């Protein structure tokens, strides 16, 4: 199979310093131009850098130019992105994708072929396992959920009643406070006659920090 | 400053679907269309304006030349939500256009609304989270409006939501208010007040700080 594998994303601090890969397989890589494509959290695709086959022409977006060198070992079947200077506006997801040629002189271009990305984070916080905090159902239909606050970074995962609740839940996708640590919730919306009887637990694990926590979620104590 | 238009559109299942771009420039090599689904990767749908990629949907379509460029699908099916990109190659730049999200027409759905107050457990911490919780609805456009003894707070809430429900085709939407213990215990009356077309007037949802 045709395929493109990007590595090397993690967290890295402001001002510094990371290389990424894209290994290359199922094909003649040394054939093809190749491109750095990025996308921002909630933001739209954004080109990057392009190499040529041989790696004698390279192109970069104005954004990344003076920063970002792009490079390949066609004997490694391996292309590379040095980033230095390191931005928070650089964090992203970094797709490689082939370039195909056609047309006239094989002048023509489009990107056919993609990795699944990796991920850099572009911060100076630390390791922080998060605070579960219950939302706890008013004193029909009910809600209720977890408050999964103030980790770092990214990702959390949540079950409810260890993976046996999951009819009527919605995990929220984590929103990055100005604080830089993350924070999330999950909720569920249950019947209130079950309010007295079943029991509702929020199964968090931060493997960042080798934080697992289960939260029972039950009417406040008044 | 490559555009496309609309920004977003709904649209059922069997709708015509019709997205269009604008190149910055007179197109000099090919403009291309990519779509892109929630969580996965782009992939290439139409090359050099028209051409269908190899295994694509006979459904989808190109057309265009110059600057103007258009996208069809003749047909939408369930599988087709996702965002959609134009890409030019011009002045030795690739560039994408800003995308067409496009989501599934139901018919609307107000929601319904919960407001959580801050645990007693986070308060010891020194900081208060409230939560306001919109669940179920459709279209996705709506307004959260966090009020604290009758003051709009504005800059000290974070939102999300869910991408469309695969069954029903709803969002969800959380909202968080965060404030100092010592700010918290300043006020008393904690409101979220939401705004959606399904509503005939805007709900609130709201608690007195220390009440059952």
């Known amino acids: 199979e045709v395929q493109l594998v990007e590595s090397g994303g993690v967290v890295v601090q402001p001002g510094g310093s990371l290389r990424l890969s894209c290994a290359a397989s199922?094909?003649?890589?040394?054939?093809?131009?190749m491109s750095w494509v990025r996308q921002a959290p909630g933001k739209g695709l954004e080109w990057v850098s392009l190499?040529?086959?041989?790696?004698?022409?390279?192109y970069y977006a104005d954004s990344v130019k003076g920063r970002f060198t792009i490079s390949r070992d066609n004997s490694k079947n391996s292309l590379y992105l040095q980033m230095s200077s390191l931005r928070a506006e650089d964090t992203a997801l970094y797709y490689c994708?082939?370039?195909?040629?056609?047309?006239?002189?094989?002048?023509?271009?489009?990107?056919?072929?993609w990795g699944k990305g990796t991920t850099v984070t572009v911060s100076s916080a630390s390791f922080k396992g998060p605070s579960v905090f219950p939302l706890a159902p008013s004193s029909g239909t009910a809600a209720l959920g977890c408050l999964v606050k103030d980790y770092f970074p990214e990702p959390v995962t949540v079950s409810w009643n260890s993976g046996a609740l999951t009819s009527g839940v919605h995990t929220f996708p984590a929103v990055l406070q100005s604080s830089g640590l993350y924070s999330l919730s999950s909720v569920v919306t249950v019947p209130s006659s079950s309010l007295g009887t079943q029991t509702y637990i929020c199964n968090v694990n931060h493997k960042p920090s080798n934080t697992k926590v289960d939260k029972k979620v039950e009417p406040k104590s008044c | 400053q490559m555009t496309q238009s609309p920004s977003s559109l709904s649209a059922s299942v069997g709708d015509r679907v019709t997205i269009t771009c604008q190149a910055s420039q007179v197109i000099s090599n090919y403009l291309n269309w990519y779509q892109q689904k929630p969580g996965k990767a782009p992939k290439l749908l139409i090359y050099d304006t028209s051409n269908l990629k190899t295994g694509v949907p006979s459904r989808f379509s190109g057309s265009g030349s110059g600057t103007d460029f258009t996208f069809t699908i003749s047909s939408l099916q369930p599988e087709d939500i996702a965002t959609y990109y134009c890409?030019?190659?011009?002045?030795?730049?690739?560039?994408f256009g800003p995308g067409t999200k496009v989501d599934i027409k139901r018919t609307v759905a107000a929601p319904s609304v919960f407001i959580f107050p801050p645990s007693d457990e986070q308060l010891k911490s020194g900081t208060a989270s409230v939560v306001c919780l919109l669940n179920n609805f459709y279209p996705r456009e709506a307004k959260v409006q966090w009020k604290v003894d009758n003051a709009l707070q504005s800059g000290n809430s974070q939102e999300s939501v869910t991408e469309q429900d695969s069954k029903d085709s709803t969002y969800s939407l959380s909202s968080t208010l965060t404030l100092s213990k010592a700010d918290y215990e300043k006020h008393k009356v904690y409101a979220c007040e939401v705004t959606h077309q399904g509503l005939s007037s805007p709900v609130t949802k709201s608690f007195n700080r220390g009440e059952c």
């Open positions: 190499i040529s086959w041989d790696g004698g022409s390279t």
């Open positions: 199922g094909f003649t890589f040394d054939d093809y131009g």
């Open positions: 994708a082939s370039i195909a040629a056609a047309g006239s002189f094989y002048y023509y271009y489009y990107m056919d072929v």
């Open positions: 890409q030019q190659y011009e002045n030795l730049q690739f560039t």
